[PDB]
Design a protein around this ligand. Structure first.
Ligand SMILES: NC(=O)c1ccc[n+]([C@@H]2O[C@H](COP(=O)([O-])OP(=O)(O)OC[C@H]3O[C@@H](n4cnc5c(N)ncnc54)[C@H](O)[C@@H]3O)[C@@H](O)[C@H]2O)c1
Ligand SMILES: [Mg+2]
Ligand SMILES: [Mg+2]
Ligand SMILES: [Mg+2]
Ligand SMILES: [Mg+2]
Lengths: 187, 442, 227, 101, 346, 56, 173, 121, 142
RNA sequence: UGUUACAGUUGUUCUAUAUGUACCAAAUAAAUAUAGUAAGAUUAUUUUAGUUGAAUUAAUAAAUAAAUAUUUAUUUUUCUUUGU
């Protein structure tokens, strides 16, 4: 079974010596995302299997205690969808745990070879543009990544600052005191 | 008529009575005369803060990026989002904080919003896709019927010879030329088309519409949507207390009931759902912006007795949030449970949208702590989802003594031996000299 | 808003129709054009047939693989989609979304070394019918390739492992596949060792050859022990 | 088989009412056919001024490249000089000495 | 057919030929008040012939014949002083040109005297032109820096900047020139109609005047050694050109070739709101006055402010099912009472 | 967006059957006119009479 | 007849999912919305009840129990042994889970509102006047929001002058 | 596909370990899986569950065989086919139905070794 | 028709949804037998083997060295006609490249990779392309 | 005068003409069955760019059919011009 990262029965029969592998650090971010969504999928499958009738109208209030699935379809759903999703979630968990063990080994080797702080600095995945995604208030002075660029504090001088004032005779309406500019209208 | 036409200015007199009515007509005093309705910009809907009042800390100003708080207030308790905040390609790149309203029309505390949800800057093409899909879908397709020439019930025989009398050459004369005949290509419900909407575009346009409502300042977050009694008078009293103009003419209200902050749910509150049925401009929608993947099991007209338009056989339900209803209803009221559900359903989407060099930093910063692996306590979920999770946890004990345990599949995979039997022509699995593999039947 | 009447352009509705019958023959599927057929025979009638099936005929079991760029694999590995600490298979590719289900057609894939002249790290991958150059690159880097030439049922079982609770007897590939890729030592087939093993030809009881995994629960609910 | 519906043009000069041909400075149909034939022949002669440059196997048309490659990949797998495969298809003989030859 | 343009070809009518008005100073604010707040901390005259003479004079000044430009300017300025009343725009402009010619010839004292007289005439004027006042005090600054008053020249340039930043509209110059690329309907040929460009240095002369003011101010600051002043002036110049570009900004319509639909130019050529006026009079800051005396709808509390009527009887809500049978009418029974209790008075 | 929804099928145009038109273009029924108050080409539009079309 | 995704029919979170509804309208009144919900629930319930009735009648006609079980399973139930391999959760179990979850939610809401009232009292006692957010430097405030926040301060918040009051310009209240 | 047994289960009842053992007790001693043949294609592939004489049903017999393999129940009956690996008693057999001589493990073992050797690419 | 016409008051035959054509109906076997499609995406040429195909009496064309095996591209007008016959499908979509002469892995995959085939375990990943599996040893028919 | 028997694949007991209920390819009911397809109609002004009598080789290694229409692509020299 090649689902896990160990190898398939075909590789076992071939006898390819792939046992000693280069232990490289791997955060498994994609695998963690997939595990999150698979967990949500399993929970949703359990919900849709355990959905029972709850009707709010008198014409349909005769079957308010039954499952919305007939027993046969409920059994078939539990046998295919629910437990296939559970098996996929288990595969993801197994892969991520294997990678976590390998990462712990790599961290230990790096700490004993260089030191704690050196290994942490070498394993840190920080990019000079990480603030553009995690804290843009620290990236404002680097580049203008705003969809409304005219309001960026670097280009903010272009946005006009009208002189508004409230008018009680108009019902608290705010109105701009800037006089309009004459427009070209004939030629 | 068209402006470039002779018939455009051929009415020279008779349009206006020279005498003005002594009730509403007035004269132009001059430049300082404030005329009602006059505005420099072309506004086909000239409303103000009195006719269509906005519900936000500030009036939307060009000097402000959004008409809400940018930092938590020191006198109000601040609640962060249920999921961590990540800024993608379309987000506003600025902190959005909105006040949560109590059903007594009071601000109890304040809550951070997600830029991926309410920060996806709107685009007219995406909103147009959303609106066009919604209208073409909400059209009624059963009434698209029309008669064909072969559905006229006339004798299948030439009425008169072509050269005999002075009448023109014709045969069955049941075609469209005659007032009683039908068309060769008539309108049919099965010949009409229903468009297909992809989940990506649907979610993007819905989040753009939410961001547009937030920018205009007509988004209001409440803690609950509950009524003491399931009657309509209690709903109308709640609307009168919250200043919700649910009249057919006032600025309508669009509710998104997702439950409380501590008690979220995917089902509407029963009392509020029974009370909200009022003949006005109010609509309640499901707490979701995503949609199911649409399919078509008759793409090649294999099932001929199909009655229904070509295209997607799984269109978007009516009670879903959409650009049409968001534009028709002025205010958008959203509950904290609905906020939590939106965040939970869009978390993995925005994480997959993220670029790789930033995705590799997610477990470093702590955005991928999965409770399934035991690195954190489980996160808050809806009532139904927590019930399903508890049901799974309880039923997990039955898969212990069986080899088909999904929580531990193929546990004897490393300890077994694989043998290639060429006489049988198969590879088999053995444990202690016993064939544990299974030959599939037939 | 108009009629693309041929050889006239986009004409206006309600305009002139007296100079367009090619437009009527375009609307109605009726066609003409014997100006080239009046004297000479068509090219498909003049050309002979190389075989009864035709060139590039995709007969049953032709082994038409979809290409997989070694550069694409290395890009996925450097990006972080694929974990190099494990043995990469087609299931791992599909789960990491490196290839779409549209491309997966029996037989699975072929590793092609287009745009790569050196592999920096050892990679252990299982595929079908990799190129000699790509195999050499992987071996020089230090990895290992295994030409896992599987049947249709084996491919489906490798792509959907959750539909099978236990291991099941997987049939050996066809004669052509056995002679081409499975028992080919150049392709590093997964049955070359079994084919070279001569202890199976002596006695029928000695025909079976066992093989073991080489050597150096998952419950989501964990006890709240931190306090 | 020409356009029976004559093209209309905005008349800016009254002599456009008199002129029948749109571009009078443009040669007639057969004249410009002959002109195009002559110009293309001169360009072809300029292109063939130098001899037929023999081309390696990779810069061949698709319907010859892979055939010529497969016709000698077997001998190319064994590195030794002086192995030639006389393939039927390929570039034809010029018939005279060529500087590229 | 190509056009040789041998014969006389009448020009074409294009929206760039629209007669653009002049930016006027408001009647309340005065140039005298601006200077004070800065210091705190008709008869017949052959005007066609004198215009020929003034054009020849400015041609001489541009070619470098300063004395001839000066005498031409003197003649035409005498003519204008006779032809126009006191404190006239053309009068003050021609004596601006005269002071410039004096300064170029080397009579710096008389140039300064004439430019101060220009300043006092501008103060006496009611609504002078922004371009006129900017050019006047630009000539003032150049005369000051020629005399040796570099700080005062920088002060004049900075007051030009502060006037143009407070009274000049940066988007009015390209209001009718911004949607012009949408007129092009061909992509293979004549595709420069989709890329028609109009430089602001030709359609906003106040912009060019202030640009030259800031350039000279930066030069003087670099000569003196005032890095702070140089940075300030360069920042303001960059902000001005950025405002101009932003007001010229616009997205693209259809890219490829469109056949027909010639009546879309009515929609293309319109008083399209410039970005500046859009962001200024956004319907939320500059709200629309809406009086309910002329309306049939009003807020919940302000029910009596609606347009009045005679013998108004509230029948019911227009429930479209009231036309149906007795069961539908029974279903629409208490809705009217509940609506009344909903819109009751506080 | 895979084949965005057609603008002509948006339910805002029920036109007379013309020469050009898509297979998904819902035109007016045979024998029925597009505009309701246009009994003739010279028929006027009723001043205060409003015919609710489409939705309720 | 023919192929239709019965494996998807009934899989959504609600009854309206995976229903080919092509007879709707862009605006639905109160009666139209009530009938839409009624028809969705009726479609689901009619499908389920008709399937159950057909299955039970077919089993009874074939001579089995209405669930399809036979004499072997009946004798197993008599002896007391478990018949099926996987006994799934019943309606009573699902309703009990929903009930206990809702009760836990209610208790958590009680404790949360207690703690939140405590924190709000502390914050209001600490801050008598509004913070930096009460400024007009970028634009006007909103009278509706001010009338909603009136109850949080001692001074009059909704009373706004016509001038764009600025924090550092003039001391408020 | 819906008539014959193609990729499709035929017995939907999934019994517990005790129900599997109780269903095996009603099998008479002396019964072997090799006794029940595979029904032809034109015969509908169905399973009535655990009824009287259920072992006579080929599809019910092997469906229960797979369920006992999952639940870990010792299968009392024999294998569907017994492989002949060595030359022992009986040293000769009679088969008027010409199937035993070709279905023999020893007869098909050598035919595979002939083909494995005959490959000459 | 009219609102109360006798033609519509009485019932008649009712038209049904018409069946569509085969998706690959307009690709012909003559092309697949004669030519083959070569070249990069936007420079594709259909080539057919050259030479004069003719069956003569015994004793003519003895020297086999003249008969050469070589492929030459067919006339561009014929290639355009044969490519338009493939363009027939989905005419209004201008962003859709013409159909290919021989089916590819991508097309055979798209045939079943849609949403409406996600549950069909069969006809997935080239089931008909793959060779057949071994039937049961006790296989028989009636 | 009426009634019988004969009905179109043919009937009036050979054939031909004639005729078989007001146009003998008889009449009634269904058909988009299909005519290498003869012809007739084909709904919407104020417009915005190239050619007006060419091309024409059945069939082994020869640079290229041309006109019309729709999209689209080449700012290289020079006294001016030049729809490639
Ligand atoms: N083409 C195929 O044969 C195919 C395809 C996909 C999956 N599978 C899986 O292969 C296995 C055996 O297939 P087969 O053709 O040999 O037999 P089968 O699937 O035709 O019959 C298996 C028997 O065991 C029962 N069973 C199946 N899964 C069970 C489980 N998890 N626990 C208890 N009882 C269970 C079935 O209901 C039936 O009685 C099954 O798990 C099946 O789902 C087979
Ligand atoms: Mg074929
Ligand atoms: Mg075909
Ligand atoms: Mg006769
Ligand atoms: Mg052309």
């Amino acid at each position: 079974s090649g689902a896990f990262g160990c190898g398939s029965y075909r590789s076992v029969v071939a006898g390819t010596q792939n046992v000693p592998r280069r232990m490289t650090f791997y955060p498994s971010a994609y695998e963690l995302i997939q595990l999150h969504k698979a967990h949500r999928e399993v929970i949703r499958h359990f919900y849709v299997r355990d959905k029972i009738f709850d009707n709010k109208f008198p014409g349909n209030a005769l079957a308010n205690g039954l499952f919305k699935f007939v027993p046969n379809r409920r059994e078939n759903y539990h046998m295919r969808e629910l437990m296939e999703s559970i098996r996929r979630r288990s595969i993801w968990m197994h892969r991520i745990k294997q990678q976590r063990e390998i990462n712990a080994k790599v961290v230990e080797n790096m700490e004993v070879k260089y030191g704690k702080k050196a290994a942490a600095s070498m394993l840190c995945f920080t990019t000079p543009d990480s603030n553009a995604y995690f804290a843009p208030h620290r990236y404002q002075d680097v580049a203008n990544s705003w969809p409304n660029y005219w309001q960026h504090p670097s280009v903010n001088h272009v946005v006009p600052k009208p002189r508004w004032r409230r008018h009680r005779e108009l019902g608290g309406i705010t109105r701009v005191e800037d006089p309009f500019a004459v427009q070209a209208s004939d030629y | 008529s068209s402006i470039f036409s002779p018939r455009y200015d051929w009415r020279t007199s008779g349009v206006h009575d020279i005498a003005p009515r002594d009730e509403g007509d007035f004269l132009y005093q001059g430049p300082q005369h404030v005329l009602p309705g006059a505005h420099p910009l072309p506004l086909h809907h000239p409303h103000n803060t009195i006719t269509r009042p906005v519900i936000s800390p500030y009036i939307p100003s060009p000097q402000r990026s959004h008409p809400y708080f940018t930092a938590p207030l020191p006198e109000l308790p601040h609640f962060s989002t249920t999921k961590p905040i990540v800024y993608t390609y379309g987000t506003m790149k600025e902190r959005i904080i909105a006040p949560v309203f109590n059903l007594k029309n009071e601000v109890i505390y304040t809550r951070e919003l997600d830029p991926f949800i309410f920060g996806m800057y709107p685009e007219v093409e995406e909103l147009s896709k959303n609106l066009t899909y919604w209208m073409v879908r909400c059209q009624n397709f059963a009434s698209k019927w029309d008669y064909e020439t072969r559905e006229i019930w006339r004798k299948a025989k030439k009425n008169w010879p072509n050269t005999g009398m002075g009448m023109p050459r014709v045969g069955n004369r049941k075609n469209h030329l005659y007032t009683w005949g039908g068309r060769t290509k008539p309108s049919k419900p099965w010949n009409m088309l229903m468009p297909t909407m992809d989940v990506k575009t649907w979610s993007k346009s819905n989040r753009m519409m939410l961001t547009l409502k937030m920018l205009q300042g007509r988004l209001q977050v409440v803690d609950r949507l509950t009524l003491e009694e399931p009657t309509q008078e209690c709903y109308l009293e709640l609307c009168r207390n919250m200043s919700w103009d649910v009249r057919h003419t006032g600025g309508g209200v669009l509710f998104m009931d997702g439950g409380s902050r501590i008690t979220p749910s995917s089902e509407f509150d029963r009392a509020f759902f029974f009370g909200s049925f009022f003949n006005g401009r109010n609509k309640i929608v499901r707490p979701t912006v995503l949609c199911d993947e649409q399919y078509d099991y008759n793409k090649t007209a294999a099932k001929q007795r199909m009655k229904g338009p070509k295209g997607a056989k799984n269109p978007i339900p009516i009670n879903r949030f959409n650009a049409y209803d968001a534009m028709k209803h002025d205010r958008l009221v959203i509950t904290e449970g609905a906020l939590m559900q939106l965040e939970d359903e869009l978390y993995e989407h925005k994480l997959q949208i993220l670029p790789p060099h930033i995705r590799n930093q997610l477990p470093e910063y702590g955005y991928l702590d999965s409770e399934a692996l035991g690195d954190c306590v489980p996160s808050l979920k809806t009532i139904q989802m927590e019930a399903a999770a508890r049901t799974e946890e309880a039923e997990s004990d039955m898969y212990k003594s069986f080899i088909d345990n999904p929580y531990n599949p193929w546990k004897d995979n490393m300890d077994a031996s694989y043998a290639v039997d060429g006489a049988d022509g198969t590879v088999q699995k053995f444990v202690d000299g016993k064939k544990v593999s299974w030959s599939m039947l037939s | 808003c108009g009629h693309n009447m041929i050889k006239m352009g986009w004409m206006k509705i309600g305009g002139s129709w007296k100079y367009s019958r090619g437009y009527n023959d375009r609307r109605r599927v009726f066609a003409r054009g014997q100006w080239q057929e009046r004297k000479m025979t068509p090219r498909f009638m003049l050309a002979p047939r190389v075989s009864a099936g035709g060139p590039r005929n995709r007969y049953e079991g032709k082994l038409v693989f979809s290409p997989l760029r070694l550069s694409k694999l290395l890009w996925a590995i450097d990006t972080g989609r694929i974990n190099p600490n494990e043995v990469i298979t087609l299931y791992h590719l599909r789960q990491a979304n490196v290839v779409g289900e549209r491309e997966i057609v029996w037989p699975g894939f072929v590793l092609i070394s287009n745009g790569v002249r050196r592999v920096p790290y050892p990679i252990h991958i299982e595929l079908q019918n990799a190129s000699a150059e790509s195999i050499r690159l992987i071996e020089e880097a230090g990895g290992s390739f295994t030409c896992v030439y599987m049947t249709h049922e084996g491919l489906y079982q490798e792509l959907h492992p959750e539909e099978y609770p236990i291991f099941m007897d997987q049939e050996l590939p066809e004669r052509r596949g056995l002679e081409s890729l499975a028992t080919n030592p150049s392709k590093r087939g997964w049955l070359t060792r079994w084919y070279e093993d001569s202890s199976k030809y002596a006695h029928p009881a000695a025909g079976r050859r066992y093989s073991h995994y080489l050597k150096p629960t998952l419950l989501p609910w964990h006890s709240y022990n931190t306090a | 088989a020409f356009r029976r519906l004559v093209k209309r043009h905005k008349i800016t000069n009254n002599q456009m009412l008199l002129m029948r041909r749109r571009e009078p400075y443009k040669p007639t149909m057969k004249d410009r056919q002959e002109i195009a034939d002559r110009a293309k022949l001169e360009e072809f002669e300029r292109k063939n001024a130098d001899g037929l440059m023999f081309v390696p196997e990779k810069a061949l048309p698709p319907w010859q490249k892979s055939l010529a490659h497969n016709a000698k990949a077997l001998g190319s797998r064994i590195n030794f000089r002086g192995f030639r495969v006389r393939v039927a298809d390929g570039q034809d003989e010029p018939g005279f000495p060529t500087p590229f030859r | 057919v190509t056009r040789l343009y041998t014969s006389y070809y009448t020009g074409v009518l294009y929206p760039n030929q629209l007669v653009q008005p002049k930016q006027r100073l408001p009647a309340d604010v005065s140039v005298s008040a601006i200077l004070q707040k800065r210091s705190e901390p008709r008869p017949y005259v052959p005007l066609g012939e004198v215009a020929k003479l003034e054009l020849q004079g400015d041609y001489y000044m541009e070619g470098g014949m300063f004395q001839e430009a000066l005498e031409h300017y003197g003649v035409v300025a005498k003519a204008y002083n006779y032809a126009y009343p006191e404190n006239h725009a053309q009068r003050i402009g021609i004596r601006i040109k005269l002071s410039a010619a004096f300064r170029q010839t080397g009579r710096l004292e008389s140039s300064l005297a004439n430019i101060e007289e220009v300043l006092r005439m501008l103060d006496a004027s009611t609504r002078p032109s922004l371009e006129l006042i900017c050019e006047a005090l630009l000539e003032l600054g150049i005369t000051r820096e020629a005399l040796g008053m570099k700080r005062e020249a920088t002060e004049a340039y900075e007051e030009a900047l502060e006037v143009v930043n407070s009274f000049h509209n940066w988007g009015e110059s390209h209001r009718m020139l911004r949607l012009l690329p949408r007129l092009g309907r061909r992509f293979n040929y004549n595709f420069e109609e989709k890329f028609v460009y109009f430089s602001p240095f030709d359609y906003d002369r106040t912009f060019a005047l202030v640009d030259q003011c800031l350039e000279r101010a930066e030069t003087i600051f670099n000569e003196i050694g005032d890095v702070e002043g140089a940075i300030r002036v360069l920042q303001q110049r960059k902000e001005m050109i950025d405002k101009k570009f932003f007001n010229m900004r616009d997205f693209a319509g259809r890219i490829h070739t469109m056949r027909g639909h010639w009546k879309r130019r009515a929609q293309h050529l319109t008083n399209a709101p410039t970005p500046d006026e859009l962001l200024r009079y956004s319907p939320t800051i500059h709200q629309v006055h809406r009086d309910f005396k002329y309306e049939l709808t009003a807020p919940i509390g302000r029910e009596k402010e609606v347009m009045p009527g005679v013998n108004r009887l509230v029948l019911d809500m227009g429930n479209p099912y009231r036309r149906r049978g007795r069961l539908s009418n029974k279903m629409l029974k208490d809705a009217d009472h509940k609506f009344a209790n909903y819109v009751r008075q506080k | 967006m895979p084949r965005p929804a057609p603008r002509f099928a948006m339910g805002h145009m029920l036109p007379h059957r013309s020469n050009v038109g898509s297979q998904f273009l819902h035109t007016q029924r045979h024998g029925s006119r597009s505009t309701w108050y246009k009994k003739h080409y010279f028929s006027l539009r009723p001043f205060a009479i409003q015919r609710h079309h489409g939705t309720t | 007849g023919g192929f239709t995704m019965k494996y998807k029919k009934g899989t959504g979170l609600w009854d309206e999912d995976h229903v080919n509804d092509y007879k709707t309208n862009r605006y639905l009144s109160a009666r139209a919305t009530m009938r839409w919900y009624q028809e969705m629930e009726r479609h689901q319930t009619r499908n389920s009840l008709n399937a159950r009735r057909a299955t039970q009648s077919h089993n009874n006609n074939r001579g089995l129990h209405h669930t399809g079980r036979g004499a072997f399973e009946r004798e197993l139930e008599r002896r007391g042994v478990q018949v099926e391999k996987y006994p799934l959760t019943t309606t009573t179990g699902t309703m009990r889970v929903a009930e206990l979850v809702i009760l836990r939610r209610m208790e958590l809401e009680k404790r949360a509102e207690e703690a939140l009232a405590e924190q709000r009292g502390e914050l209001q006692k600490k801050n008598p006047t509004p913070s930096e957010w009460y400024d007009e430097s970028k634009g006007p405030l909103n009278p509706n929001f001010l009338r909603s926040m009136r109850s949080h301060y001692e001074v009059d918040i909704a009373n706004l002058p016509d001038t764009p009051l600025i924090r550092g310009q003039r001391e408020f209240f | 596909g819906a008539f014959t047994k193609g990729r499709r289960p035929v017995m939907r009842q999934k019994y517990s370990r005790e129900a599997l053992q109780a269903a095996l007790a009603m099998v008479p001693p002396g019964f072997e899986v090799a006794d029940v043949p595979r029904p032809p294609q034109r015969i509908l592939a169905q399973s009535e569950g655990i009824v009287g004489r259920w072992y006579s049903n080929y599809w019910t017999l092997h469906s229960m065989r797979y369920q006992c393999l999952l639940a870990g129940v010792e299968w009392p009956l024999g294998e569907r086919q017994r492989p002949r690996t060595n030359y022992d008693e009986p040293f000769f057999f009679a088969d008027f139905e010409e199937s035993k001589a070709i279905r023999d493990y020893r007869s098909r073992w050598i035919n595979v070794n002939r083909s494995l050797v005959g490959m000459t690419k | 028709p009219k609102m109360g016409c006798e033609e519509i008051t009485r019932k008649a035959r009712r038209v049904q949804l018409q069946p569509t054509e085969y998706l690959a109906q307009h690709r012909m076997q003559v092309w697949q037998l004669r030519f083959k499609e070569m070249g990069p995406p936007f420079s594709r040429v259909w080539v057919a083997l050259g030479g004069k195909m003719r069956r003569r009496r015994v004793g003519r064309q003895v020297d086999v060295k003249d008969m050469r095996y070589y492929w030459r591209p067919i006339e561009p007008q014929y290639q355009r006609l044969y490519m338009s016959r493939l363009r027939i499908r989905d005419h209004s979509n201008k962003l859709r490249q013409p159909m290919r002469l021989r089916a590819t892995n991508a097309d055979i995959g798209s045939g079943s990779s849609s949403i409406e085939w996600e549950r069909a375990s069969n006809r997935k990943y080239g089931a008909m392309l793959a060779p057949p599996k071994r039937q049961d040893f006790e296989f028989r028919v009636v």
